[PDB]
């Protein structure tokens, strides 16, 4: 793409600079360039990719929610088409970012990912970006978008339970996000709560095996599970 002339290592270096500068759109463009070099990503590189797009789409989602709230209130004086148009503009940009990430995953990150840690990470991301599409979907494809998220999360869950310990941060983060999927997207709050609780309790029982540094990583995500459970119960 626009990054085709830049060295892979320079793209990664610049992604790290962009992160320090809180330039997440640039960070994402650099990481997209790096992915498009065609080589597999290391753990650190996978995390740069995820951070960049999480921040970009996170900003878009927050803006979409503000606009959707304003639009909903307007449909409870007539102010014309502008609120819908601008919500649609932000929505279309959001969808474009999601399609970009899903495209990277499909061409060809997932198919080359053989190790559990990489394959679960990418399948989790696939679930996440279909979940963001589902948040804004209102038409004929809504059910299929929801099912695409579910299917990606479920494949990730199946691999994670076979291949990773219950405290592995990727396994924990996957469960956290799939539980949110159940609560917010699939209208399955009991499934959400059961998943969060089971994940927390199984992790608790495996903490004894960990170093101090691994313990810190795992417990941080466990706290997020507890935070959601507190919100939901």
């Amino acid at each position: 793409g626009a990054m085709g002339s830049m060295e892979r290592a320079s793209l990664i270096q610049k992604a790290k600079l962009a992160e320090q500068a809180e330039r997440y759109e640039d960070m994402a463009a650099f990481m997209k360039g790096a992915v498009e070099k065609g080589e597999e990503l290391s753990c650190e590189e996978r995390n740069l990719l995820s951070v960049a797009y999480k921040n970009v789409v996170g900003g878009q989602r927050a803006a979409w929610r503000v606009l959707s709230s304003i639009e909903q209130k307007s449909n409870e004086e007539e102010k014309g088409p502008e609120v819908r148009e601008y919500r649609e503009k932000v929505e279309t940009e959001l969808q474009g970012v999601c399609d970009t990430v899903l495209g990277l995953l499909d061409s060809h990150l997932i198919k080359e990912a053989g190790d559990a840690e990489s394959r679960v990470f990418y399948l989790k991301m696939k679930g996440d970006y279909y979940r963001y599409l589902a948040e804004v979907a209102t038409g004929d494809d809504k059910k299929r978008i929801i099912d695409s998220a579910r299917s990606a999360y479920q494949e990730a869950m199946d691999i994670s339970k076979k291949e990773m310990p219950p405290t592995n941060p990727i396994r924990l983060g996957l469960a956290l996000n799939f539980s949110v999927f159940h609560y917010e997207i699939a209208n399955s709050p009991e499934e959400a709560i059961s998943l969060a609780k089971t994940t927390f309790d199984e992790a608790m029982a495996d903490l004894h095996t960990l170093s101090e540094d691994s313990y810190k990583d795992s417990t941080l995500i466990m706290q997020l599970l507890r935070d959601n459970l507190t919100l939901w119960t």
């Binding site: 996440d128 956290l176 996000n177 935070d227 959601n228």
Partner: peptide, 5 residues
């Protein structure tokens, strides 16, 4: 809004 990572 619930926590995700």
């Amino acid at each position: 809004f619930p926590a995700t990572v």
